[PDB]
């Protein structure tokens, strides 16, 4: 069982973001870390849209990220600390569009060790040193320098080690050009492990220590060490030297503190709390992220609290020292992992979950009468400041980046009756969670739709003047007549364009600067600028069949295979060429290449015959109409188009052919010689395919329409072919106007419409449907196609508990003090939207939960059930109990009073509902109590399997409750998932891996007959066949366990092997994905594809695991992988074989993410690798692209 791994959708969650001048110019970029991927994002200042410039997969865990400038340096370097045991320094190369590793220095073993550095990374603000440290007892400083050829040089590491010592954060201090300082949030656990009473743990305290790098003596000395009052959680570098004082801001729970070494006294400001807050009063408040904005004038900090509140922080300096901290409510934004104030007045918030946002800073917070808190404001003993949150004032949302993080559940199904399946995914945390429906293809938005009198044949768009940016006319053709339109704000038929409305037109365009051509079967009509008209009548009985028109040259084909072309001579009047060219067979269709910008006219004319062969013809005056190159074909062709794609130099010239079969052929065409080279066929749709040239991103894409439209374009200098997610179209062409600059005019039958493709380069388009809490599971009702979703949150209030809590507070406002009730009235009245102001947090053991019945197409809530305040839903089923008949029931397992640390539960219930009204409604039937949380429910042969804790039970429906039969009690730990096939049950223990249990009817008992030999923390499972189970862990790896061929499940209930079952299952595949998988499902993704195993990670990624069908493929892909592991090693100093073998050695998988980085290697390296495979680099790219094509997208 040899599998191949592919990534369809890369991870989208963001761990780190740094902003800098990475390209080396005026423009500012962001470098985001998506855990396993490093991306370069450049946001447009005028447009405001974020563009992804680079995305490289590093095969490691990126644990820290910083940006670094040398002294007097324009470009910034990226310093990455990872789990590789080395520190790398990277430089972005814009000419090449790739990161370039500049330095790689090795200090330790790999993995996320406790004492090997890599976790914290701090750079000196001038750029002279960098400091990398582990969680405890290991720090290392590297000195960075520039040589005389302006290249970066690195030194040997200087070490600062301190035993028994924990580091919470490390930041580099801005001392001007003195010796570099680094500040730390240290703690010493040495005393605490030697006090049996436990006092020394209680009263040991965190210190701030300053390390000084003495550049004279080449060694690092631990200078200053001062205990803190409470525990901070991170530090902020205060800009210093010439600009501002040099110190550190320590953020701690409920406080922000300025400290510096010297005579400066410590300055503390409480953090403002929200006025009339619904939270638990015991909970403190911390800051989660910060950002500094340094102008040349002044500076401030933007720090966000747990609840999403962003404050401005400004320091007031009385000469050398600072005297108070001033703290002002700025706005409320979703909780972030990173914020980046770009220099062009934007703020980039990377949310820790969900979508990311790019705001524009309208106003700094300096007006509008808003109270400003301060450390100097004298405040009474217990109580603190309060503020009132509000909608956005300082920020305007400009762009939003879709993120699937975290995919909590997924199901690949066809619920919308179009042939391709869609992916139904549940993701997001709390209020911002949502059900998303992902489809394969570009989002298509339509501007206008309008009726047409009859079925229209073809549609063209005509520009008045070649210089004009926007189009003037729209031409539509019918069987008998042509209808012509003039665009604008309003599009209405105009009759004075000079076009003929009597006979169906075959093409309309603009030769020359202003001349206009209409070619119809009767003849060819030429319209000057001054509107005098010329006619060219066809000679003889024969009439025009097909025409191909350029900006300066026109070719027509009369009946019988006669070719005629007219050239635009400098008189401006189309002159016929002296001699016509006979051809052997009649011509179906032909195309003429777009004229190059400088050149006078296009050399090559591609004509397609009825003999399934296409012949290239030459238009040079030396040899006008003389054959050059012919290719044969499987089926007769419908349409050709010759385009230039990939140009930024000049793009390389391609011939696209379409056939009756439905397959699209994209073929190399040599510009100077005209020799077609390699044709990579693709099968799209079921009807004849028709090709039309369009313009996207100022680039010349092609649109091929079959049963479903398919757009072929180049993105990030890489070709793409993705189908428009929109209904079939008869004909299309390019369109440009003030309302839409780059669009498509398409006529489907008896209609006309204008289409704009807003997002390109994507793999999935999505729609999102809001939920209230985090979705745990859902099920599909088979008949109705609805979804039954359970949502749950810890620390949460349900709706009713929130209303009672609020009423209690409004009573308390009156009990405090005659005007107050008026305020309490407003307090009961105003509602802050919970998806943008957070959800109030309730405490440990507080659980809000909801059942919801939902229409997948429309998105509306068909029914909603709200549960009691400490009842938490964990499982759901929909099933027909066979005894009661055909009547759907929904079972929901609920835990009552669950604490997580340490674990305890008061009990569980199973709620039964019936599904009435064809799935619209739930009718409560009964509630049956179980003694531990029912974590898995599975329908099983007319009855249900419920695992309550470690007990596996069969339940049947009774009228007063569910009824228990044949419970098993030998599963080792908590049951987390149950799968069935036949009379076999596969139970996923929380840490004991898979257990195979057989249910024998006529004894009424459940018998363990097999299991696994490894401890595994299983998150999900899926059955590949009758003997195989695929599983996934919390630690990020997938396994495939098979059952050996001899095993019988005829076991009758002592011995056991190894304290377990007597029969053991063999592990036949291990693979470390890198990110936690929560959903495996075996499915087919495209129509006419093969099956695959699809998995969706927590971070938002989607991949497939596809099995090889031959040994020759398997040997090819294994050799490609083994070459690339040495030729093109991972960008952060990690080993690939070691990465994929993180917990268990890699077995039977070829990493295809590594293999498809063939196309990113340098051409000498591609040629060198492809020598030993005995293939040319086009053949290697073709084989890498064939397996992706026949399984996936």
């Amino acid at each position: 069982m040899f599998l191949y791994n592919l990534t369809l959708q890369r991870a989208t969650g963001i761990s780190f973001a740094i902003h800098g001048n990475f390209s080396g110019t005026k423009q500012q970029e962001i470098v985001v870390s998506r855990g396993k991927i490093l991306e370069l994002l450049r946001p447009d200042p005028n447009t405001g849209k974020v563009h992804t410039l680079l995305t490289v997969e590093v095969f490691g865990v990126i644990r820290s990220l910083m940006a670094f400038r040398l002294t007097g340096g324009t470009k910034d370097y990226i310093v990455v600390g990872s789990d590789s045991g080395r520190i790398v320094i990277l430089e972005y190369q814009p000419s090449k569009n790739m990161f370039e590793k500049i330095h790689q220095e090795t200090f330790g073993k790999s993995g996320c060790r406790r004492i090997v550095p890599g976790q914290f990374l701090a750079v000196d603000p001038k750029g002279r040193a960098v400091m990398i440290s582990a969680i405890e007892k290991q720090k290392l400083v590297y000195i960075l320098n520039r040589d005389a050829a302006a290249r970066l040089t690195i030194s040997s590491p200087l070490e600062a080690h301190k035993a028994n010592t924990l580091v919470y954060h490390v930041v580099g201090v801005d001392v001007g050009f003195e010796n570099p300082m680094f500040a730390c949030l240290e703690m010493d656990y040495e005393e605490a492990d030697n006090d049996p009473t436990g006092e020394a743990a209680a009263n040991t305290q965190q210190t701030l220590t300053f390390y000084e790098l003495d550049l004279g003596l080449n060694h690092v000395v631990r200078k200053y060490s001062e205990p803190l009052e409470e525990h901070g959680n991170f530090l902020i570098t205060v800009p210093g030297g010439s600009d501002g004082p040099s110190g550190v801001l320590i953020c701690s729970e409920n406080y922000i503190t300025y400290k510096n070494f010297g005579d400066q006294p410590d300055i503390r400001c409480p953090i403002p709390r929200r006025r009339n807050d619904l939270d638990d009063p015991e909970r403190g408040m911390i800051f989660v992220c910060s950002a500094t904005h340094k102008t040349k004038s002044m500076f401030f900090f933007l720090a966000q609290t747990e609840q999403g509140d962003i404050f401005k922080i400004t320091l007031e300096t009385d000469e050398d020292m600072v005297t108070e901290i001033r703290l002002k409510y700025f706005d409320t934004v979703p909780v972030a992992a990173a914020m980046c104030v770009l220099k062009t007045g934007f703020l980039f918030v990377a949310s820790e979950f969900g979508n990311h946002y790019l705001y524009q800073i309208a106003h700094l917070g300096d007006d509008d009468e808003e109270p400003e808190f301060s450390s100097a404001m004298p405040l009474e003993e217990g109580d603190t400041f309060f503020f009132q949150p509000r909608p956005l004032k300082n920020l305007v949302l400009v762009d939003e980046l879709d993120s699937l993080s975290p995919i909590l559940f997924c199901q690949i199904a066809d619920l919308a009756n179009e042939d391709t399946p869609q992916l139904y995914v549940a993701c997001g945390r709390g209020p911002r969670s949502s059900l998303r429906v992902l489809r394969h293809g570009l989002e298509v938005s339509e501007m206008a739709v309008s009726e047409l009198p009859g079925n229209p044949n073809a549609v063209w768009t005509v520009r008045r003047h070649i210089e004009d940016e926007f189009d003037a006319y729209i031409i539509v053709s019918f069987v008998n007549a042509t209808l012509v339109l003039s665009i604008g704000e309003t599009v209405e038929e105009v009759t004075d364009s000079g076009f003929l409305g009597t006979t169906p037109t075959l093409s309309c365009s603009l030769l020359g600067d202003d001349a206009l051509v209409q070619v119809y079967p009767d003849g060819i009509r030429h319209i000057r600028a001054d509107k005098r008209v010329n006619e060219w009548k066809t000679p003889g009985k024969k009439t025009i069949v097909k025409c191909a028109v350029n900006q300066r040259q026109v070719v027509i084909a009369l009946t019988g295979g006669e070719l005629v072309y007219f050239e635009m001579d400098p008189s401006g009047q189309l002159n016929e060429y002296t001699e016509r060219k006979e051809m052997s067979a009649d011509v179906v269709c032909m195309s003429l290449a777009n004229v190059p910008p400088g050149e006078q006219r296009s050399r090559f004319l591609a004509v397609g015959l009825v003999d399934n062969t296409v012949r290239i013809i030459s238009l040079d005056p030396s040899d006008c109409l003389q054959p050059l190159s012919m290719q044969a074909l499987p089926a007769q062709p419908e349409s050709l188009c010759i385009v230039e794609m990939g140009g930024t130099s000049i793009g390389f010239l391609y011939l696209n052919i379409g056939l009756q079969n439905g397959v699209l052929l994209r073929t190399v065409l040599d510009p100077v010689t005209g020799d077609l080279s390699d044709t990579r066929t693709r099968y799209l749709g079921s009807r004849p395919v028709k090709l039309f040239r369009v313009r996207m991103q100022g680039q010349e894409a092609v649109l091929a329409m079959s049963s479903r439209s398919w757009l072929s374009y180049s993105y990030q200098s890489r070709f793409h072919l993705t189908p428009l997610s929109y209904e079939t179209l008869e004909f299309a062409s390019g369109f440009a106007s003030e309302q839409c600059p780059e669009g498509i005019v398409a006529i489907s039958t008896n209609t006309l419409r204008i289409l704009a493709l807003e997002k390109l380069g994507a793999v999935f388009n999505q729609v999102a449907f809001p939920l209230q809490y985090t979705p745990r599971k859902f099920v599909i009702h088979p008949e109705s196609n609805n979804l039954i979703i359970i949502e749950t949150d810890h620390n949460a209030y349900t709706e009713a508990t929130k209303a009672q809590r609020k009423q209690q507070m409004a009573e308390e406002m009156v009990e405090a003090a005659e005007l107050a009730a008026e305020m309490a009235a407003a307090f009961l009245n105003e509602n802050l939207p919970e998806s943008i102001f957070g959800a109030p947090k309730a405490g440990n053991g507080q659980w809000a939960s909801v059942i919801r019945v939902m229409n997948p197409i429309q998105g509306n809530t068909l029914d909603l059930v709200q549960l009691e305040q400490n009842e938490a839903a964990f499982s759901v089923a929909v099933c027909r109990f066979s005894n009661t008949g055909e009547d759907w029931y929904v079972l929901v397992g609920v835990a009552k009073d669950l604490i997580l640390n340490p674990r305890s539960v008061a009990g569980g219930f199973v709620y039964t509902y019936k599904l009435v009204n064809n799935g619209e409604k739930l009718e409560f039937l009964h509630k049956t109590p179980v003694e531990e949380v029912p974590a898995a429910i599975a329908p099983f042969q007319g009855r249900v399997l419920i695992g309550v804790g470690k007990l596996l039970r069969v339940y049947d429906l009774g009228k007063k409750k569910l009824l228990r039969k044949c419970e098993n009690k030998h599963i080792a730990n908590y049951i987390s998932g149950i799968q069935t096939i036949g009379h076999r049950v596969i139970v996923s223990d929380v840490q004991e891996s898979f257990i195979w249990v057989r249910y024998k009817r006529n004894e009424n008992q459940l018998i363990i007959f097999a299991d696994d030999t490894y401890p595994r923390w299983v998150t999900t499972a899926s059955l590949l066949d009758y003997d195989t189970v695929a599983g996934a862990d919390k630690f990020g790896n997938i396994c495939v366990v098979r059952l050996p061929p001899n095993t019988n499940d005829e076991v009758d209930e002592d011995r056991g092997l190894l304290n377990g079952a007597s029969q053991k299952a063999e592990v036949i595949m291990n693979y470390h994905v890198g990110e936690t998988v929560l959903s495996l499902q075996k499915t087919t993704l495209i129509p006419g594809g093969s099956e695959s195993l699809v998995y969706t990670t927590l971070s938002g990624g989607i991949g497939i695991l596809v099995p090889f069908t031959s040994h020759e493929d398997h040997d090819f892909f294994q050799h490609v992988e083994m070459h690339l592991r040495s030729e093109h090693p991972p960008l952060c100093g990690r080993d690939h074989l070691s990465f994929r073998s993180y917990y268990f050695p890699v077995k039977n998988v070829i990493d295809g993410d590594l293999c498809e980085q063939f196309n990113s290697m340098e051409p000498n390296k591609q040629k060198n690798v492809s020598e030993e495979l005995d293939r040319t680099p086009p053949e290697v790219s073709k084989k890498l692209e064939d397996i992706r094509t026949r399984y996936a997208f």
Partner: peptide
Amino acid sequence: RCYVCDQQTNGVFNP
């Protein structure tokens, strides 16, 4: 495919 060694022609056929 071809006649000489049954190579993939891919339609490509040149003077």
